[PDB]
Coordinates of C-alpha atoms and ligand atoms in Angstrom, one line a residue:
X149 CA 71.5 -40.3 10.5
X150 CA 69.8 -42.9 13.2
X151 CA 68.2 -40.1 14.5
X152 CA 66.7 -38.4 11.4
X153 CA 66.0 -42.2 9.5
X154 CA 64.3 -43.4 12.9
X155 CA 62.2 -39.8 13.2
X156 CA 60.0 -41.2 10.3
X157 CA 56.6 -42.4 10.5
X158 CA 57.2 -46.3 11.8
X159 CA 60.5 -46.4 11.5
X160 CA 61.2 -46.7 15.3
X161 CA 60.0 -50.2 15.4
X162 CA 62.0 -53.1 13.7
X163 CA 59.8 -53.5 10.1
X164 CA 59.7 -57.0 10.4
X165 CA 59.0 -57.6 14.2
X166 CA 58.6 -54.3 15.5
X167 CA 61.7 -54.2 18.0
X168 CA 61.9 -50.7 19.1
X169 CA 65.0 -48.6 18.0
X170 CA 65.9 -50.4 15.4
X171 CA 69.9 -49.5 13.9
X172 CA 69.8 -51.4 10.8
X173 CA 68.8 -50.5 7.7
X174 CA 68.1 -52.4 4.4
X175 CA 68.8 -49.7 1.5
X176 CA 67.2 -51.1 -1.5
X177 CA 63.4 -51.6 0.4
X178 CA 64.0 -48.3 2.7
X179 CA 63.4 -49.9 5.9
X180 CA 64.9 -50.1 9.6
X181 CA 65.8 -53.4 10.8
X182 CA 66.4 -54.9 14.6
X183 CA 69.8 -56.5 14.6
X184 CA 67.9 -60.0 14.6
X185 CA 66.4 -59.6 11.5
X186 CA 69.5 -57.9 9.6
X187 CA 71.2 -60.6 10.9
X188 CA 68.4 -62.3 8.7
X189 CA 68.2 -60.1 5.9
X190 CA 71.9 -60.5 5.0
X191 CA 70.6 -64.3 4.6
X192 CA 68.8 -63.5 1.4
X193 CA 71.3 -62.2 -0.6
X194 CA 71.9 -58.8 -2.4
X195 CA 69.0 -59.0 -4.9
X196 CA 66.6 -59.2 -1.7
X197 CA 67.8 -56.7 1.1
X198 CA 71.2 -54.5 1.4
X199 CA 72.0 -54.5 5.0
X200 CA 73.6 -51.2 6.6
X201 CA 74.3 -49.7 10.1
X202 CA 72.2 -46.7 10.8
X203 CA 75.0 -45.8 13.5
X204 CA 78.4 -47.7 12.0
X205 CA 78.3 -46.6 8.5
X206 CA 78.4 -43.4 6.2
X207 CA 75.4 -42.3 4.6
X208 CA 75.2 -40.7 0.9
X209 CA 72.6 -37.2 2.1
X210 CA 70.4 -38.2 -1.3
X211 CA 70.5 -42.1 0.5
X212 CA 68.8 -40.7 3.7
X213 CA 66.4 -39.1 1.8
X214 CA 65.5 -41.7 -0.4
X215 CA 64.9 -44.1 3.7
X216 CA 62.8 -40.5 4.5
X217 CA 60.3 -40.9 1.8
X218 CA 60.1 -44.6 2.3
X219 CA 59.9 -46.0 5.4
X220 CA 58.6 -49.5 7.4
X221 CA 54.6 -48.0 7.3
X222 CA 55.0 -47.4 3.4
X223 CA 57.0 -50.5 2.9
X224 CA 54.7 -53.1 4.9
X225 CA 51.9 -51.4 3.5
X226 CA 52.9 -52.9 0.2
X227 CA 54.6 -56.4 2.0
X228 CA 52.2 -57.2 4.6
X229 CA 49.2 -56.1 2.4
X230 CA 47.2 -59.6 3.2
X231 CA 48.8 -60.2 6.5
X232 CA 45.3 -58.9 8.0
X233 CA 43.4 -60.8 5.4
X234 CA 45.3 -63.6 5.4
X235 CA 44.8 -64.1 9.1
X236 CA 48.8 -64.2 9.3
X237 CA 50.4 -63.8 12.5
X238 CA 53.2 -61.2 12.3
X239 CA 56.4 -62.0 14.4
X240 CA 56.9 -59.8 17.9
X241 CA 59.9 -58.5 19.3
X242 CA 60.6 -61.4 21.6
X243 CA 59.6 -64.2 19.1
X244 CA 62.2 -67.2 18.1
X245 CA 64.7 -66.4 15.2
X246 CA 63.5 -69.1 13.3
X247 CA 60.1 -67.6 13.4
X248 CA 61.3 -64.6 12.4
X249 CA 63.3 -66.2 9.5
X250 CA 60.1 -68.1 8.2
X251 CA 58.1 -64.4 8.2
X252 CA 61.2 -62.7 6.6
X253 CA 61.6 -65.1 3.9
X254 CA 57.9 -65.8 3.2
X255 CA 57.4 -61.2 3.2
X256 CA 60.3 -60.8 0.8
X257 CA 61.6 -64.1 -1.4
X258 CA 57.8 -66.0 -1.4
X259 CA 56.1 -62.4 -1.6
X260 CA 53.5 -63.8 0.3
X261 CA 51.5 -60.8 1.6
X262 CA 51.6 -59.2 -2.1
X263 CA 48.1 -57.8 -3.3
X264 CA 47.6 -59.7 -6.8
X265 CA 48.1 -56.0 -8.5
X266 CA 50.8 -53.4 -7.8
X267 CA 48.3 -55.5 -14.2
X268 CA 51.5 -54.6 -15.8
X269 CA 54.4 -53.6 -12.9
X270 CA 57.2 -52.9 -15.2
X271 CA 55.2 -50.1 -17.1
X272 CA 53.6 -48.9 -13.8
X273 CA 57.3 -49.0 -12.7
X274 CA 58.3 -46.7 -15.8
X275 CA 55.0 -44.5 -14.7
X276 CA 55.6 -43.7 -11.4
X277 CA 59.4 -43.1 -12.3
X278 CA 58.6 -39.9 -14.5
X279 CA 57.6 -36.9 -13.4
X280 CA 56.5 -36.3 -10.7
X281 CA 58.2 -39.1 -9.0
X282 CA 55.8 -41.7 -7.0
X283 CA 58.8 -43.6 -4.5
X284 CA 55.7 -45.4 -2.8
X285 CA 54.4 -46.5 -6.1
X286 CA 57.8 -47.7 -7.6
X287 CA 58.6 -50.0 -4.3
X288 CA 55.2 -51.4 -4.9
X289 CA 55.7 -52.0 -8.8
X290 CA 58.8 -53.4 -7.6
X291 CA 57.2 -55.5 -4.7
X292 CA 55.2 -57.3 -7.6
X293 CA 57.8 -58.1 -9.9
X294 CA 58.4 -54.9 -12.1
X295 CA 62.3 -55.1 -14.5
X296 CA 64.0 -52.6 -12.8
X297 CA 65.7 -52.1 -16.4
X298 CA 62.0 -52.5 -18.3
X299 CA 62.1 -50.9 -21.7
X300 CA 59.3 -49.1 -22.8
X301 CA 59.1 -51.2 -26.5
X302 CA 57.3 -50.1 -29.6
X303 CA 57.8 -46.4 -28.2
X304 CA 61.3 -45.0 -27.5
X305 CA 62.8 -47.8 -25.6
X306 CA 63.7 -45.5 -22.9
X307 CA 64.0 -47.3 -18.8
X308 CA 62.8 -45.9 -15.6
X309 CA 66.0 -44.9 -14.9
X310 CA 65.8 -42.6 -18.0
X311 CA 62.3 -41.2 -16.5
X312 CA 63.8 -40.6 -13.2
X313 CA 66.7 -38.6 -15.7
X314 CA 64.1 -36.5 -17.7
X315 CA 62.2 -36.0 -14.2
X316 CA 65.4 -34.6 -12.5
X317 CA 64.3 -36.6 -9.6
X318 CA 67.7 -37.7 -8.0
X319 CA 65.6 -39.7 -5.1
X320 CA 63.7 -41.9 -8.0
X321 CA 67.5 -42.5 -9.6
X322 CA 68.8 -43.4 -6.4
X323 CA 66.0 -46.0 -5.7
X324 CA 66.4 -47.4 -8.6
X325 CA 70.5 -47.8 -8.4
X326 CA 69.7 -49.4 -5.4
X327 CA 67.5 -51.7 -7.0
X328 CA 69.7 -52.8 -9.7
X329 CA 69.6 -50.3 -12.4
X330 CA 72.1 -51.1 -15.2
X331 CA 73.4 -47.1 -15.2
X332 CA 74.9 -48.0 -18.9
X333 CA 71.4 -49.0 -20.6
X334 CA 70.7 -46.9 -23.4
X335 CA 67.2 -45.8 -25.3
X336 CA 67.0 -46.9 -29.2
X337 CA 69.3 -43.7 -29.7
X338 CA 71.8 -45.2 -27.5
X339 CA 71.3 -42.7 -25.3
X340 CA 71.9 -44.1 -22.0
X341 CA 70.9 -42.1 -18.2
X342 CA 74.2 -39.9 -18.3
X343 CA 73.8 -39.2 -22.0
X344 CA 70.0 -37.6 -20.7
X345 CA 71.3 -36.1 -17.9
X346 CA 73.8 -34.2 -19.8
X347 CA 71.5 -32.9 -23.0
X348 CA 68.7 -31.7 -19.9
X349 CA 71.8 -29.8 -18.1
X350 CA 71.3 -32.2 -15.0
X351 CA 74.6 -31.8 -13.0
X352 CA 73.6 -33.6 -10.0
X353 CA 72.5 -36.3 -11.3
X354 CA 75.5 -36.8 -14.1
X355 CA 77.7 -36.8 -10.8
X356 CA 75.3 -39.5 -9.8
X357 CA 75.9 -41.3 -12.7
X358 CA 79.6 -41.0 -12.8
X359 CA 80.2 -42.2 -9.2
X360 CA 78.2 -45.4 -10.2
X361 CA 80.6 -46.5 -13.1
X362 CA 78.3 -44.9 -16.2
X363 CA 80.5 -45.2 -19.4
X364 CA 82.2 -41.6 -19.9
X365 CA 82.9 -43.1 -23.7
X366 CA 79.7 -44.4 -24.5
X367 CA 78.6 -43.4 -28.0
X368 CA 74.8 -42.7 -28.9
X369 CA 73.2 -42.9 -32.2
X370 CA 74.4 -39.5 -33.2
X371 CA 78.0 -40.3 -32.4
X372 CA 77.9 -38.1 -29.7
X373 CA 79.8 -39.0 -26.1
X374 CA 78.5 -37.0 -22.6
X375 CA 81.4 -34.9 -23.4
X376 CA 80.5 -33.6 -26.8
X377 CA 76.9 -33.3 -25.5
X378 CA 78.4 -31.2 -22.4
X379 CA 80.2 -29.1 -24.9
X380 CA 77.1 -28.3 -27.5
X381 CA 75.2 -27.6 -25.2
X382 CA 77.9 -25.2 -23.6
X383 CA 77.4 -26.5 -20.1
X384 CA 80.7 -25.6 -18.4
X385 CA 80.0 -27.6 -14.9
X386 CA 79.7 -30.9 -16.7
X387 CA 82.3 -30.7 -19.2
X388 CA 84.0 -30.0 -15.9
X389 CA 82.3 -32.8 -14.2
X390 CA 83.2 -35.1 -17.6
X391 CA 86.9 -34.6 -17.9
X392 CA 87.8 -35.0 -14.3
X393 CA 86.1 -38.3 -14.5
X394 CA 88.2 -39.3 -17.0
X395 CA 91.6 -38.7 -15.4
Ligands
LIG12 ZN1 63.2 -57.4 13.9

């Protein structure tokens, strides 16, 4: 894991003061982390950064993808946009933690560094979402303050999540988890992400789902559950999938 996740462009220097061989990990951003600024990162809370152990902990295959197509160049890129501009002084390896605390905090909660455009983030969110998948795109809509859960209104109400569904991208769905994706929100048909991944025949990704607490009873417009869809559509696997998840 420590070695794949560090064999990716940047990745082998701490993302926020460039300490080489970084083990840490924060899983929501998809960047590696020295174990001073982890040690920071698990200062700002959930919402902000969630701290892992390249080394210590088990990692979900789709999870060390997702870290593969993201990645401290992509992710600063986006953070430290206006560092250069700014004439900002970015922390080194050796530099005080308090110094490094003051850069963390002003990169990720004061968004600092941010370009003033990603004009609209939570559509170019739902955009990039859809097929074909833009990971880079969605951590910058993100970045610049995009509703993880925006609904695309006056249309069919449908999330990014429910893109990332349609798109059978299970990296775009996993970024998005990890980013606070409500798994149970439905379109205007009440057809929530395991409702679409069910009618499109999407196994994976309804095992996705499923492992992340989606409602097995939830009931769409139609009156329909994943199960009856499963059946309908005469999709033995997640029928399967379906009825083991509810014993
Ligand atoms: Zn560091």
């Amino acid at each position: 894991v420590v070695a794949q996740v560090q064999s990716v462009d940047g990745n082998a220097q701490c993302c926020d003061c460039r300490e080489p061989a970084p083990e840490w990990a924060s899983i929501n951003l998809g960047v590696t982390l020295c174990i001073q600024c982890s040690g920071i990162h698990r200062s700002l809370g959930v919402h902000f950064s969630k701290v892992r152990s390249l080394t210590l902990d088990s990692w979900e295959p789709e999870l060390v993808k997702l870290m593969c197509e993201l990645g401290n160049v992509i992710i600063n890129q986006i953070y430290e946009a206006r560092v250069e501009a700014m004439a900002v002084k970015k922390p080194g390896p050796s530099c005080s933690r308090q110094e490094k605390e003051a850069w963390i905090h002003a990169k990720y909660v004061e968004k600092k560094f941010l370009t003033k455009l990603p004009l609209h983030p939570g559509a170019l969110l739902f955009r990039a979402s859809g097929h074909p998948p833009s990971l880079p795109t969605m951590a910058d809509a993100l970045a610049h303050g995009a509703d993880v859960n925006w609904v695309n209104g006056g249309q069919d109400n449908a999330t990014p999540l429910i893109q990332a569904t349609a798109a059978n991208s299970l990296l775009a769905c996993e970024f998005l988890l990890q980013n606070g994706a409500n798994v149970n929100q439905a379109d205007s048909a009440g057809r929530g992400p395991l409702h679409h991944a069910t009618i499109l025949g999407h196994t994976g990704l309804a095992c996705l789902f499923l492992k992340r607490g989606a409602d097995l009873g939830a009931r769409d417009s139609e009156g329909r559950d994943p199960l009856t869809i499963a059946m309908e559509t005469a999709n033995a696997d997640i029928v399967t999938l379906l009825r083991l998840a509810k014993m």
